């Protein structure tokens, strides 16, 4: 497991796509990392296929698709204003 933090661009976006959830019965995986985005250019670097376990320190094993999606955009869970992600490549 490798931890990855980052911050959104001026439009508050990050530049990666997700899929899965409790509703899709799929683990939550990175679907694509657009180049040039923050998520493309962080160290350690996000990549397609990493499985996410936590977001800002929250176990999402039993959460849905729209629910997770709301978790990321909640720009207030971010300490120092960076979005913390824990993934399992």
């Amino acid at each position: 497991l490798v931890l990855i933090r980052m911050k959104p661009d001026e439009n508050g976006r990050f530049g990666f796509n997700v899929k899965g959830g409790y509703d899709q019965k799929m683990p939550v995986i990175v679907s694509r990392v657009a180049p040039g985005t923050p998520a493309d250019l962080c160290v350690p670097r996000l990549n397609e296929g990493d499985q996410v376990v936590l977001i800002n320190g929250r176990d999402i094993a039993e959460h849905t698709h729209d629910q997770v999606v709301l978790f990321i955009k909640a720009s207030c869970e971010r300490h120092s204003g960076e979005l913390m992600l824990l993934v399992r490549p």
């Binding site: 530049g15 997700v18 899929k19």
Partner: peptide, 7 residues
Amino acid sequence: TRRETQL
């Protein structure tokens, strides 16, 4: 099909 969302 199965929904994927962009962030």
